[PDB]
Each structure stands twice: as C-alpha cells, then as structure tokens.
Amino acid sequence: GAAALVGGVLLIGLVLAGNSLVCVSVASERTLQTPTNYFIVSLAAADLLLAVLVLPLFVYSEVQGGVWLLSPRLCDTLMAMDVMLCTASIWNLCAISVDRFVAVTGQCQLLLIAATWLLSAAVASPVVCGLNDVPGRDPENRDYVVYSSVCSFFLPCILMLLLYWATFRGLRRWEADLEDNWETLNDNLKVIEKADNAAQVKDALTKMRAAALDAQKAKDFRHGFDILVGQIDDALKLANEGKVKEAQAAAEQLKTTRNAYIQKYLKITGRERKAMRVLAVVVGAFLVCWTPFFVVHITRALCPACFVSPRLVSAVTWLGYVNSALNPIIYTIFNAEFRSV
Amino acid sequence: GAAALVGGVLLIGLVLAGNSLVCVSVASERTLQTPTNYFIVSLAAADLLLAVLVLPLFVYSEVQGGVWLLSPRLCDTLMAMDVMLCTASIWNLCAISVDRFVAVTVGQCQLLLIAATWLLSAAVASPVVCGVCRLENRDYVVYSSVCSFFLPCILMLLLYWATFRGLRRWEADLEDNWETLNDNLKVIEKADNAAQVKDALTKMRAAALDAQKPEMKDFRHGFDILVGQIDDALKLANEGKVKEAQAAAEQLKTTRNAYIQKYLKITGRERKAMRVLAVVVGAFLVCWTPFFVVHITRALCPACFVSPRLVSAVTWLGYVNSALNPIIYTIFNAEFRSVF
Ligand SMILES: Clc1ccc(N2CCN(Cc3c[nH]c4ncccc34)CC2)cc1
Ligand SMILES: Clc1ccc(N2CCN(Cc3c[nH]c4ncccc34)CC2)cc1
C-alpha cells in the first residue's frame, strides 16, 4: 500500500542530495567550470527545484490516493510548476546537446539557457484560470495537455535524435579526414623505404608533408607537431640532394619520432569518444524514463475509450521523476570526469 | 502564568539591545562599511521593526490568551507586517550567504539585491489585505511558508557548502604551488646543464603566476617581488651562468618560506570568517525551522491536532532568532569582538 511512501522519500532524499552536488562542484572549482558545465548546473538546479515545489506535494497527494483536498488555485500553481520544470529540464538537455557541437567557430551561452527557461514558462504559464474555472471540476485540460506534451516532449525528442545523429556523422567525418593522413603517411614511408630514384623519395616526402596540414583541424599537441616538421623538412632537403641512402635512416628516425606522439593522440581520440558515449547515455536515460510518461499523457488523454491503466499512470509518473535523479547519477557513476565530489 | 510575560518582555528588551547595539556600533566605528556588514543594516532595521510593530502587539495577544480584541483589519495589518519582516530577515540572511559565496568565487551590485529583498518581503505581505488572528488562510499559508523559508534555507545551505568547497580548492591550489616551488627549488639547488635550468625556471615562473589569484595588497607585493626575482634569475641563467641561478634561488627560497606565514594567517582568517556563517545559519535554522514546519503541516493536515501551546512555543522560538542574530554577529569576527 504505502510503497510510494518509502520509495517517495528515498527518491526525494537522493534527488535533494543528488543534483545539489552538481551545483556545489562547478560553482566551487575553476578547472571544471565550462559553458557545458554551466548548462549542466542550470539543468541540475532545475531538477533541484522540482524536488521541493512538486515532489513533496505530489507525494502527499499520492498518499491520499491521488485525491486532492485544497482549492483549485494551489493545484493549478503546482501543476504549472511541474510543467515548467519538466519543460525546462528537457530544454536544458536541448541546450546541452546543442552546445555539444565543437565544430563551430566567452560565447553567448546566456541565450540558450534564457530561451530554455522562457519557453519553459511560456509553454506552461497560460493556465487561463485553471481553464476558466471549468464547470464541475470537483477533485489537466484539453487542447493544452496536447500542447504541453508536444512542445515539451516530442519536439525535444526529435531534437535529441537530430543532435546525436549529427554528432555521429560529424565525428565520422573528422576521423575520415584524419584517416586520410593516417594512411598517406604510412604509404609514403613505405615508398621511401622502397623507392628507386631521387624523385620517388621526393614525392613520398611531399605527400608526407602534405598530410601534415590537413590534420590541423581540431596545449601539448602543439609542441609535438613542431619538432617532427623540422625533421620532415630535413629529410626533404636530403632527398633533394640525391641522398636516398641517407633518407632511409632519416625516415627510420622519423618513424621512431612520430610513433611517440601516436600514443598521446589516441588517448584524446578515446577522450572524445567517451564524451560522446556519455552524452548518448544521458539522452538514453532521459528517453527511457520520460517516454512511457508522455506516451501515456498523450494517448490516454487522446484515446478516451482505450485502457489507460491507473497503475500505469502512477508508474510512468514515478519513472519520469526517477529520470530527474538519473542524470546526476550519470555524471557520477557512469562518467568519471567529475572527480570533485 | 506570569513567567510567560516575563520571558516575553526580556526577549523584546534583548532584541532592542542587540539591534540598537548593531546600529550604534555601525554609527561609532566608521570601519564597518564593508560588504560583510553592509547587509547587517537591513537585518537590524527589520528586527527592530519586528520588535516594535509585532512583538508588543504579539505579546498583547499572547497574554490576552489568543482571543485578540482588535479589529480583524488591524489584525491583518499586523500579520502583514510580521510576514514582511520575517521574510526580510531571512532574505537578508540569504543575501549575506550570497555575498560570502560571490566574494569567494571572484563591486557594488548588492543595492539591487537588498532592494529586491525588501520588495519581495512586501510582495509576500500583500495578500493579507485580501485574506482569531492566526494565518486564517490555507492556500496563502503554504505559499508564504514555502517561498519565505523552504527556498532560502536550502539556497543558503547550498551556497554555504559551495563556499566550503571553493575555499578548500583555493587552499589546495596554493598548497600545490607551495610544494611545486619546493620541488623546483630543490631541483635547481642540484641542477646540471643549462637547458634543464631554463625549463625548470619557466615552470617556477608559471607556478608563481598561477598562484596569483588593507592587507590583501601586502600579499600580492610579495607575488610581484618573487616574479621579478624569478625574472632576475632567468636573465642570469639564460645568459649561460649556472651559479647565479643558485645565487638568486637562495633569496627566492627565503622569500618563499617567508610569505607562507602570512599565507597561513590568511587561511586561518578565512576559516574564522566562515565559521561565523556556519553558526549564524545553524542558529537561524534551529530557531525558524519548527515554526514553518508545523505551519505547513497544519495547512496540509487539517483534521490533525495542533495544540496552541505549540503555536506559542514555536512563535517564541522564531522570534529568538531575530533576538540572537545581532548578538551572534557581535560575538564573532574581530570587528565587534575586539572593540568591546
Ligand atoms: Cl490530486 C493531484 C495533485 C498533484 C498532482 N501532481 C501535479 C504535477 N503533475 C503534473 C505533471 C507531472 N508531469 C507532467 N508532464 C506534463 C504535464 C503535466 C505533468 C502531476 C502530479 C496530481 C494530482
Ligand atoms: Cl489570536 C492571535 C493574535 C495575534 C497573532 N499574531 C499575528 C502575527 N503573527 C503571525 C506570524 C508570526 N510568524 C509568522 N511567519 C510567517 C507568517 C506569519 C507569521 C503571529 C502572532 C496570532 C494569533
């Protein structure tokens, strides 16, 4: 019976302690404050707000079985608060995964959070006096629940889908433009070690120094790229002077040098691959826990003579609010970048 | 029950004593005009207003027996005054915590904050115009109990843990620079060729500048002094002279282990300036928590017993914080502690 009591108090306690640390970490440290992390702070503070203006009163309503006792104005304020807060969290996800496009030329990160917070209100603000004191309310409204289920769920869902697909395509294009140089350098070194005349080593060193500039597309990565370019130019000069017998040893030293930075560059490669993975994980948790919710909230409201399942309604509400405590868990146990506890 | 009025009169007298003492100390020191004490003026004003416009008539009622013979419109005016002042006190405590956290995290942008503080204190006291003389409302009661206590309490708690974490990070960064300079100086004492000296001295300069983040100026004067001495050593070293690197490193080590005394004194001063925040916010919570908890409970649990003795006790407990906060400000921090 009172399964919502224990579960509710555990959820509210671990969401009070959950997103609060995400706010105490950024505003304290300086090496971790980024516009991405500022968006994360806005998102977590949005989840911290829902833990008090909705969760306790929602749980107390669920204790009586869902039967409301106070007037209509208080219930309308609490419901509009919940709509604004969920819309704000999902549009904070929107702004976060929009800022996660480093392929763009500090920045005006104010506008994203501001528009998120404004449309969160603008979509949830017009309560029109609880639908104009609709008659026989006794103890949600048409043509507005549909609006707050489309503009607050479906549209940001397609936004997340578009953003992750664009991220996939962009990272694949970046790694392809890098793999071009990856293969050209090996082919040219092989040619140098197997050439026949002074022009073949020259062409191989040309194509080697050619691929050196196509990789400039994005601190210690600078000091590494400046030492081997001089060696490549020395090898090019030696090959220009008809010194293949010396260009071979030059290429041996060049391989021994560049393979020293290979092992430092692949770490950054895996660095960003894991970042994209954790982004996908955050969006996937959002979907997992808020899809059955808004699916029910749109279908049962649009499908009258179809089963709605009261138990399913309460369960999808509990799941959607479990998401509110899932995103600060993902930046915690699923992601190891937030070392400051 | 004569002891009730005795305690009430003593509490009113001590509210007057504490807040008027804050006022007189501000008006007789001239060195208290700092952002730390900038908010205490609003606190003293709000507490004196609570002790003149509520507490006399509040105790009138409390000794009358809760009957209240006053017209319900004057009752609503007094209730609005009490809401406004109890809201202004808590919002100004939140603003104190805000100022502390911002001073930890980074001119005069607190006038807007105090103006909004008192404006919102008035905004929560307006629906009493359209509302026994208790909080005779259900929807409004929860609203005022939530927006005026349940929000600022957790907000200042979060800001206070943020102050703790930021101060710990500042401490850790400066201790890291300390040990980095220790290691680099122990290296230069034993350095061999000149390129290693150049690299290590670049490292030392980088650490010295990375640490650079009435007496806060005397700490930075040693910063630029050490920077200029590192520049001296770097010139004498890149000129191809190894012994002069150590010659300058001797005085650099002297300056380094000399500034640490003032650094640790500053760390102790910051810890002491945060402990007063701890005590103040903790006492405020202890005093003003059960009142609003029982209020929101009685507003959420109608057919649930709330004895009026609880009402009187928690109201006295709430007013105890308005009595105590100037005393707590005077006991801690050496501005008022060393004068008296
Ligand atoms: Cl008697 C009673 C008392 C309180 C409540 N609560 C109010 C807040 N909630 C509304 C809500 C949660 N998620 C949403 N998503 C989109 C649109 C609306 C919502 C639901 C729970 C419900 C019944
Ligand atoms: Cl029969 C009777 C007669 C007079 C009173 N008084 C009215 C003014 N007071 C209201 C009050 C105290 N703290 C608050 N915090 C937030 C909001 C309102 C308040 C309490 C004392 C009470 C009962």
Author numbering:
A (entry chain A): 31 to 135, 144 to 177, 183 to 218, 1001 to 1043, 1059 to 1106, 304 to 378
B (entry chain B): 31 to 136, 144 to 168, 179 to 218, 1001 to 1042, 1056 to 1106, 304 to 379
Study authors write:
The dopamine receptor family, which belongs to the G-protein-coupled receptor (GPCR) superfamily, can be divided into two subfamilies, namely the D1-like subfamily (including dopamine receptor D1 (DRD1) and DRD5), and the D2-like subfamily (including DRD2, DRD3, and DRD4). DRD4 is characterized by its more selective expression pattern in the brain, and thus exhibits promising pharmacological properties. Although dopamine is the most potent endogenous ligand known to activate DRD4, the receptor is also readily activated by epinephrine and norepinephrine.
To aid crystallization, we replaced the long, presumably disordered, intracellular loop 3 (ICL3, that is residues A2205.70–A3026.24) of the receptor with a thermo-stable variant of apocytochrome b562 (BRIL). The crystallized recombinant DRD4 protein contained four additional point mutations, F1213.41W, P2015.52I, P3176.38A, and C18145.51R (superscript numerals refer to the Ballesteros-Weinstein numbering system; Ballesteros and Weinstein, 1995). Moreover, DRD4 formed a non-symmetrical dimer in each crystallography asymmetric unit. Here, we describe the binding pocket of DRD4 on the basis of L745870 bound to Mol-B. This antagonist was buried in the upper part of the TM core underneath the signature C1053.25-C18045.50 disulfide bond. The heterocyclic ring of L745870 resides in the relatively hydrophobic orthosteric pocket, surrounded by V1133.33, F3306.51, and F3316.52 from both sides, and by C1163.36 and W3276.48 from the bottom. The chlorophenyl arm of L745870 was observed to protrude into an extended pocket of our mouse DRD4 structure, which is also present in the human DRD4 structure. In particular, the ligand-binding pocket of DRD4 extended from the orthosteric pocket into a crevice between TM2 and TM3, rather than a crevice between TM2 and TM7 as observed in the D2 and D3 receptors.
